[PDB]
Amino acid sequence: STHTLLGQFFQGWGTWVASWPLTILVLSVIPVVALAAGLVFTELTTDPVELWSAPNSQARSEKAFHDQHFGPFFRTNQVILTAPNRSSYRYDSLLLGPKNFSGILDLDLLLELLELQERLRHLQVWSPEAQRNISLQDICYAPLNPDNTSLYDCCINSLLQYFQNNRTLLLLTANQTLMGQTSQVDWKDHFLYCANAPLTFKDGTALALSCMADYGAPVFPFLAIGGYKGKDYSEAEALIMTFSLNNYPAGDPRLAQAKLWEEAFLEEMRAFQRRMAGMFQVTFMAERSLEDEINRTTAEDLPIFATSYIVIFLYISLALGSYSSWSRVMVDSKATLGLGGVAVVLGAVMAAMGFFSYLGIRSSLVILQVVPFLVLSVGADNIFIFVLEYQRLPRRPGEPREVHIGRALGRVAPSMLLCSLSEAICFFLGALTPMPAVRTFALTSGLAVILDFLLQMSAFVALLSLDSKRQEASRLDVCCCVKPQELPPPGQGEGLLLGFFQKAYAPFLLHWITRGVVLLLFLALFGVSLYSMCHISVGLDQELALPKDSYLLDYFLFLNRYFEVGAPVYFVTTLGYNFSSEAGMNAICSSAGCNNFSFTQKIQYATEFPEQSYLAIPASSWVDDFIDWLTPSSCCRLYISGPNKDKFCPSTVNSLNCLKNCMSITMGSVRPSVEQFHKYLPWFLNDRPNIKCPKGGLAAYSTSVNLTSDGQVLASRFMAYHKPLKNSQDYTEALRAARELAANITADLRKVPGTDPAFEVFPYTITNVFYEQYLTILPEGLFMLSLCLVPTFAVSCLLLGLDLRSGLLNLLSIVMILVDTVGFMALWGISYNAVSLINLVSAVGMSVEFVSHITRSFAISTKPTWLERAKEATISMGSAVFAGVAMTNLPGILVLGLAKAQLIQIFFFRLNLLITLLGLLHGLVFLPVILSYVGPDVNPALALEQKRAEEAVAAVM
Numbered sequence: 001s002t003h004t005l006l007g008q009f010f011q012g013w014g015t016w017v018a019s020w021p022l023t024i025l026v027l028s029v030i031p032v033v034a035l036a037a038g039l040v041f042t043e044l045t046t047d048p049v050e051l052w053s054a055p056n057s058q059a060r061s062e063k064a065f066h067d068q069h070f071g072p073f074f075r076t077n078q079v080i081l082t083a084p085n086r087s088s089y090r091y092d093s094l095l096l097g098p099k100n101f102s103g104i105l106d107l108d109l110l111l112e113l114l115e116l117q118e119r120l121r122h123l124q125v126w127s128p129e130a131q132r133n134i135s136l137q138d139i140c141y142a143p144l145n146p147d148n149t150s151l152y153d154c155c156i157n158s159l160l161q162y163f164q165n166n167r168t169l170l171l172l173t174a175n176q177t178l179m180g181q182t183s184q185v186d187w188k189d190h191f192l193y194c195a196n197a198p199l200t201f202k203d204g205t206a207l208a209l210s211c212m213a214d215y216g217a218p219v220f221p222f223l224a225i226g227g228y229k230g231k232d233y234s235e236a237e238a239l240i241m242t243f244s245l246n247n248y249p250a251g252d253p254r255l256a257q258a259k260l261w262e263e264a265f266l267e268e269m270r271a272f273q274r275r276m277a278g279m280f281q282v283t284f285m286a287e288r289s290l291e292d293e294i295n296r297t298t299a300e301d302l303p304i305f306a307t308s309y310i311v312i313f314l315y316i317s318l319a320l321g322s323y324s325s326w327s328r329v330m331v332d333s334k335a336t337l338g339l340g341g342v343a344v345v346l347g348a349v350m351a352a353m354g355f356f357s358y359l360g361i362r363s364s365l366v367i368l369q370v371v372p373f374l375v376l377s378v379g380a381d382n383i384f385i386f387v388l389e390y391q392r393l394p395r396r397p398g399e400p401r402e403v404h405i406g407r408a409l410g411r412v413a414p415s416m417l418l419c420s421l422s423e424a425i426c427f428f429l430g431a432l433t434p435m436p437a438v439r440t441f442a443l444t445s446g447l448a449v450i451l452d453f454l455l456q457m458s459a460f461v462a463l464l465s466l467d468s469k470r471q472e473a474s475r476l477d478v479c480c481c482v483k484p485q486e487l488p489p490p491g492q493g494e495g496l497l498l499g500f501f502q503k504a505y506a507p508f509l510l511h512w513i514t515r516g517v518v519l520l521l522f523l524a525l526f527g528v529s530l531y532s533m534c535h536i537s538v539g540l541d542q543e544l545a546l547p548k549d550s551y552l553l554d555y556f557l558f559l560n561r562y563f564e565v566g567a568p569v570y571f572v573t574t575l576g577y578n579f580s581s582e583a584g585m586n587a588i589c590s591s592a593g594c595n596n597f598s599f600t601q602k603i604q605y606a607t608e609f610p611e612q613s614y615l616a617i618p619a620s621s622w623v624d625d626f627i628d629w630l631t632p633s634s635c636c637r638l639y640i641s642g643p644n645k646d647k648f649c650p651s652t653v654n655s656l657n658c659l660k661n662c663m664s665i666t667m668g669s670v671r672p673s674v675e676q677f678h679k680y681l682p683w684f685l686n687d688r689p690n691i692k693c694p695k696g697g698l699a700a701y702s703t704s705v706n707l708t709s710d711g712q713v714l715a716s717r718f719m720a721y722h723k724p725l726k727n728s729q730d731y732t733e734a735l736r737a738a739r740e741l742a743a744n745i746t747a748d749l750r751k752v753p754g755t756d757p758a759f760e761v762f763p764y765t766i767t768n769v770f771y772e773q774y775l776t777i778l779p780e781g782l783f784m785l786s787l788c789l790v791p792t793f794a795v796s797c798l799l800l801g802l803d804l805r806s807g808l809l810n811l812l813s814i815v816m817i818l819v820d821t822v823g824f825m826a827l828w829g830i831s832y833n834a835v836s837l838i839n840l841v842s843a844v845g846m847s848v849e850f851v852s853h854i855t856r857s858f859a860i861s862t863k864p865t866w867l868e869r870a871k872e873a874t875i876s877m878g879s880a881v882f883a884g885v886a887m888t889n890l891p892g893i894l895v896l897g898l899a900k901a902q903l904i905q906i907f908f909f910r911l912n913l914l915i916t917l918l919g920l921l922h923g924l925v926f927l928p929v930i931l932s933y934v935g936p937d938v939n940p941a942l943a944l945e946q947k948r949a950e951e952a953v954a955a956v957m
């Protein structure tokens, strides 16, 4: 047997370590200090939200292709106003009749918003390293003037961009006589005209105001107002103000300038929120806000979390003392054992984190917030079980205490090796997740558990050999430097936990009426959890990642309640498509003699059913606008002759020298040639729209087409908009629907004669990297749990020498614990994600402590009947399991309920509490009752004695 060999080795090792305690203490404490000294050398914490993306996923490669060919997506800063206390009012329009206007659409509130926007556009920030003051124009996203950017070329979207941010145009007034009705046209008529026709250069009213933004692009009504249903724009309940900035890679120095300006913007918006208390109800969001809202509560929650170490120091040496009398309460306190155990757990956690800081592995908030208080839950169990088995084992006559300590260690050492080995294997198998923040946490927890077992095989055995040598002396517990007293002798009264209660609790549990009741209650609980696991929700809401006292939660409430569209989505066409042949242009069209089921018509028909697809606004095509930009009327022109014979006549040139159209006439469905396409495409892409040529140019498609030196098209993107997505299920369904529509597009686009294979069209959204995991998280989680359940059962049958019946009977208990945990997690509204998956994977290994000790104690009992063996196994090991395994993880788990971040308080406190209570209930109430009915038969258990006697005679030389 390979169990008695491990027991004999641990007996000899325990005798040697007890013989050389000071040497083993110094040679085990110096390497731990050497490993833990590197918490400064390369100790860095990864703060952004790129810890929540798999770097090799398909979405990450699509983002890499998009950022390579078009530049990164811009940073967004948003404000939502929604003045709630004002009443709506009736307005008699001249071109539309009677209408209801909201209370927020008033001139005074618009003037206050114009003041806030003008003050926020002129904000300047000092970059700290002796540089210049950073203005908005250095960092703003200018869509149609990126090189020589000005302060009025920045993309700022709001309602006031309909009036070009001009306070005089907002107060403009003129009366119009329409059907003999002189009526006072004002700003409301112009806003009603621009809400329906955003690309307009002359208003159709008495006041002939323009409608374009001051930087030159049209502003759509869903980017400027919210809270309306349909096309009743005047009843909008919210105003939206957006500042868009350029995005750069993480090493770039301009990202620091953008983040400094975003911090100044956030301080200015907090001042505006305090100033307008009885007027608006402002909520705001900067692009940097989520990262420093996630990484904010760590330092203010670590010292509150550190009181569990003091509580676990208190619980040891009060549950391990000997209260035989008041004359010797101080001498048997065992406080040195609790202090050594807390030092062992702290040293193991610090050594694991220091070793990972040696290799340059970045830390995160989850590691610093739950690793020292999750390792502490499972680290003191083996220490408490070893000390309790040492106390319960009587000493033979004429036996030294070193041999006694080795003999006590040799009985419980393989089971406490099995528990730590199963926990380490479960953590390392759970470290196969794609998420880096979960992978580093799993690796740190597994290394901490391995170092904890290696520390408690040597340093705790040396400390227990040391403090038990002052106990035969009359030295006091922690004040052992002096004061040895008379000390009347102790008695073997069996204690209170082992003696009194378990020999008055075991009669209750193993009654004939308690056993059947426990069986048909646990089976019904298993069936109810099996039914209730199917109502579980897959995903992780972003609002759960924030603290409760966060300003981002009010923003997410207003965004989910008032926005009419979601984030923009780009359908990107990669390398391979021609775009220059007529057959390639007909497969992209939407009008004028093109194909019946094209790209854009497919997207538009997808937008007609916004519950099946998740698109609300149809895609804008550069191909269609290029086709009807080339339609000849005052739009593309060529010079007749001169110094420039045929160069280009833009629309801002008045002369008789520009009379020839770029294209010709008399052909229906005007398609340019290959030469005309390659010659005329950059002029369309650089053309600025105006009153006599509003048709298109660099406002929308200057950055949506990548060209080469020859003038061919490498890649393209077509922009549409999602519907409002409120939860992670909406994000995952929108990603799946967009990918299915892109595959349907690609299968049709590949049929065009000339398009090479491997051309594809894919959807790109800024949030795609965070929600691609949930398409395939369920079978990967089932595969990880099935892979974790194998080696625990494999190593529980060679280490402990268990029979197949004993090996199956606790595998059943672990499966019931997992099923009941998933059922209660469905009941409590705990979603299924990577964090809860790693918690369940750790719970597979933590639950072997509840069952393996009791099963091994039942298997090695030479009692006559089955009920007597179950009673002896309960009284022997269920008391130790309750006092150690069930009680050490209560403080570390219960201190995480004061977490102040919702992720720690939901996925680590509630789930670990459910796993602990279900494991205790399945270990101490179900396992003895199921063992009393069906269990292993009696086995020869004298092999342990006849192999222990050889080591006990080998311990003297």
Ligand SMILES: *[C@@H]1O[C@H](CO)[C@@H](O[C@@H]2O[C@H](CO)[C@@H](O)[C@H](O[C@@H]3O[C@H](CO)[C@@H](O)[C@H](O)[C@H]3NC(C)=O)[C@H]2NC(C)=O)[C@H](O)[C@H]1NC(C)=O
Pocket: 068, 069, 070, 071, 706, 707, 714
């Ligand atoms: C239009 O599309 C072209 C081709 O993708 C793109 O040029 C590419 O720009 C990206 C980003 O700047 C570069 O990654 C890429 O090649 C870069 O150039 C160096 C010097 O030769 C290479 O050694 C590197 O592979 C790489 N640099 C880095 C940081 O990886 C570059 N490729 C070429 C051939 O130009 C244009 O930028 C796109 N145009 C627009 C307007 O974005």
Ligand SMILES: *[C@@H]1O[C@H](CO)[C@@H](O[C@@H]2O[C@H](CO)[C@@H](O[C@@H]3O[C@H](CO)[C@@H](O)[C@H](O)[C@H]3NC(C)=O)[C@H](O)[C@H]2NC(C)=O)[C@H](O)[C@H]1NC(C)=O
Pocket: 578, 580, 581, 674, 754
């Ligand atoms: C995208 O589609 C375009 C339209 O089919 C392609 O343009 C075609 O390129 C051909 C060469 O590959 C041209 O044939 C050459 O033209 C001469 C002069 O007309 C002909 O005598 C020859 O057949 C041929 N050259 C030789 C070998 O002498 C096609 O005329 C031309 N099509 C049209 C209608 O202009 C592009 O090549 C294609 N782009 C890519 C990247 O494949």
Ligand SMILES: CCCCCCCCCCCCO[C@@H]1O[C@H](CO)[C@@H](O[C@H]2O[C@H](CO)[C@@H](O)[C@H](O)[C@H]2O)[C@H](O)[C@H]1O
Pocket: 049, 051, 052, 076, 078, 285, 290, 294, 366, 437, 542, 545, 559, 566, 567, 568, 766, 767, 770
């Ligand atoms: C270990 C766990 C720690 C990591 C947890 C990570 C949780 C998930 C974080 C999601 C991050 C992305 O979060 C998302 O960011 C974008 C930034 O454009 C915000 O989007 C913002 O800009 C877009 C423009 O593109 C607007 O349409 C939108 O209204 C605005 O809010 C989204 O409203 C926010 O949901």
Ligand SMILES: *[C@@H]1O[C@H](CO)[C@@H](O[C@@H]2O[C@H](CO)[C@@H](O)[C@H](O)[C@H]2NC(C)=O)[C@H](O)[C@H]1NC(C)=O
Pocket: 166, 167, 168, 169
């Ligand atoms: C805001 O609009 C007003 C009116 O259109 C602009 O004032 C006009 O400016 C032009 C050129 O300077 C003058 O010829 C007009 O006589 C002015 N009209 C009035 C009534 O003042 C003003 O320039 C605009 N402001 C901005 C910032 O462009």
Ligand SMILES: CC(C)CCC[C@@H](C)[C@H]1CC[C@H]2[C@@H]3CC=C4C[C@@H](O)CC[C@]4(C)[C@H]3CC[C@]12C
Pocket: 024, 027, 028, 031, 032, 351, 451, 454, 455, 458
């Ligand atoms: C946190 C880590 C470092 C704790 C584990 C340290 C272990 C692996 C180390 C610490 C002290 C070491 C012992 C120190 C001295 C000796 C005596 C030598 O003649 C044989 C090896 C032996 C017996 C070593 C075995 C390995 C040992 C027990």
Ligand SMILES: CC(C)CCC[C@@H](C)[C@H]1CC[C@H]2[C@@H]3CC=C4C[C@@H](O)CC[C@]4(C)[C@H]3CC[C@]12C
Pocket: 039, 040, 043, 044, 045, 302, 306, 309, 346, 350, 353, 368, 372
């Ligand atoms: C009982 C437990 C909690 C005690 C151990 C706590 C350890 C793991 C914690 C407490 C304070 C922490 C440090 C607090 C601040 C910083 C600065 C930061 O730029 C790098 C990480 C670093 C250096 C942390 C490393 C981990 C740390 C040392």
Ligand SMILES: CC(C)CCC[C@@H](C)[C@H]1CC[C@H]2[C@@H]3CC=C4C[C@@H](O)CC[C@]4(C)[C@H]3CC[C@]12C
Pocket: 318, 319, 323
């Ligand atoms: C005449 C006999 C019955 C006197 C009995 C008095 C005994 C039972 C009293 C005296 C001191 C008491 C102990 C003081 C503190 C603790 C800490 C707690 O974590 C376990 C219970 C325990 C250990 C108490 C159990 C009850 C106790 C041991």
Ligand SMILES: CC(C)CCC[C@@H](C)[C@H]1CC[C@H]2[C@@H]3CC=C4C[C@@H](O)CC[C@]4(C)[C@H]3CC[C@]12C
Pocket: 428, 429, 431, 432, 439
């Ligand atoms: C990020 C990329 C580039 C590097 C590879 C990272 C991942 C895939 C690697 C790094 C270290 C690896 C672990 C190293 C050791 C073990 C212990 C073994 O018993 C099970 C596998 C396990 C747990 C590995 C799983 C995969 C792992 C986590």
Ligand SMILES: CC(C)CCC[C@@H](C)[C@H]1CC[C@H]2[C@@H]3CC=C4C[C@@H](O)CC[C@]4(C)[C@H]3CC[C@]12C
Pocket: 006, 009, 420, 421, 424, 449, 450, 453
């Ligand atoms: C995974 C973590 C928790 C524990 C790892 C502990 C490992 C290193 C331990 C457990 C069992 C050990 C073995 C037990 C038996 C012997 C026989 C002895 O004559 C030589 C050493 C040797 C062969 C040991 C080497 C170290 C060993 C493999």
Ligand SMILES: CC(C)CCC[C@@H](C)[C@H]1CC[C@H]2[C@@H]3CC=C4C[C@@H](O)CC[C@]4(C)[C@H]3CC[C@]12C
Pocket: 824, 827, 828, 913, 914, 915, 917, 918, 921
């Ligand atoms: C063996 C263990 C798991 C048994 C104890 C489970 C306890 C802690 C669990 C099981 C079901 C849980 C409840 C399930 C649902 C709700 C409704 C929610 O709006 C508030 C919390 C509340 C009221 C939970 C409180 C905690 C709860 C009572």
Ligand SMILES: *[C@@H]1O[C@H](CO)[C@@H](O)[C@H](O)[C@H]1NC(C)=O
Pocket: 098, 099, 100
């Ligand atoms: C405006 O709201 C009032 C509420 O009573 C309603 O009577 C009227 O029909 C509404 N007018 C329009 C144009 O919707």
Ligand SMILES: *[C@@H]1O[C@H](CO)[C@@H](O)[C@H](O)[C@H]1NC(C)=O
Pocket: 124, 131, 132, 133
């Ligand atoms: C910003 O920059 C200039 C040049 O460094 C500096 O002199 C000036 O004082 C700064 N602006 C303000 C308002 O302080």
Ligand SMILES: *[C@@H]1O[C@H](CO)[C@@H](O)[C@H](O)[C@H]1NC(C)=O
Pocket: 148
């Ligand atoms: C940029 O614009 C300014 C103001 O119009 C002009 O003076 C300057 O010459 C321009 N710079 C370049 C690079 O042409």
Ligand SMILES: *[C@@H]1O[C@H](CO)[C@@H](O)[C@H](O)[C@H]1NC(C)=O
Pocket: 173, 174, 175, 182
């Ligand atoms: C039309 O215009 C003026 C100024 O807006 C207005 O005050 C007046 O009532 C109107 N004039 C006439 C014809 O009554």
Ligand SMILES: *[C@@H]1O[C@H](CO)[C@@H](O)[C@H](O)[C@H]1NC(C)=O
Pocket: 084, 085, 277, 278, 279, 280, 281
């Ligand atoms: C609206 O008015 C009520 C009563 O005056 C007040 O309690 C509430 O806070 C106000 N809300 C806002 C945002 O003005």
Ligand SMILES: *[C@@H]1O[C@H](CO)[C@@H](O)[C@H](O)[C@H]1NC(C)=O
Pocket: 596
């Ligand atoms: C569909 O295709 C045919 C032939 O190309 C065309 O005549 C028709 O107008 C298209 N749509 C329909 C059926 O109206």
